[PDB]
Amino acid sequence: HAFRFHHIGVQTSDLENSLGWYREFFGCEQNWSLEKFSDLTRSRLPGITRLVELAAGDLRIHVFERAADATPAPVAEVPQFQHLCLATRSPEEMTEWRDRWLELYESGRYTFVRDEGPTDIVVDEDGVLSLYVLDVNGLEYEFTYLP
């Protein structure tokens, strides 16, 4: 492969809320954190205060927070990295991901930008199973199962 996917950056308004939820939901473990930045990093992410590299499966997730006064929601209309899709290994795991989401939502340990619950697990013309959930930032994750 000419290149390889390395990490996705997740910008949040509440880093500690996101870190806790990502660890419990995805099983992320922390590889490092950073609070001192290059000029270049600060020019791409003005006001960044803390950055953490998380890891789950093959996925690296850099979660960071920038100094801000307000806490806006995501804007659905604008060009964007709109969703991230993870593949599961069985229809049973799809149900488990859905149940685990509701369990974390009902636990009262996290704040969520949106009130929206998970979709049902749906099947398409080819047997593919789909599930969409939102992280605590209102960002969309898709779970899929490929027969």
* Interacting partner of 59 out of a second copy, Fe ion, none (Cβ under 5 to 8 A depending on kind): a second copy
What is the Cα–Cα distance from 133 to 22, expressed in whole angstroms?
A: 13
* 34 lies in the site for a second copy, by CB under 8 A: no
50 pairs with which residues across the strands?
A: 65
* 90 lies in the site for a second copy, by CB under 8 A: no
* 142 lies in the site for Fe ion, by CB under 5 A: yes
Question: In the complex with Fe ion, which residue's Cβ is closer, 24 or 142?
Answer: 142
Q: Which of residues 2-41 bind Fe ion (CB under 5 A)?
A: 9
Q: Reduced to 3 states, what is the DSSP secondary structure of residue 139? A: coil
* Interacting partner of 36 out of Fe ion, a second copy, none (Cβ under 5 to 8 A depending on kind): none
Residue 93 burial by Cβ neighbours in a 10 Å radius (0-12, 13-18, 19+):
middle
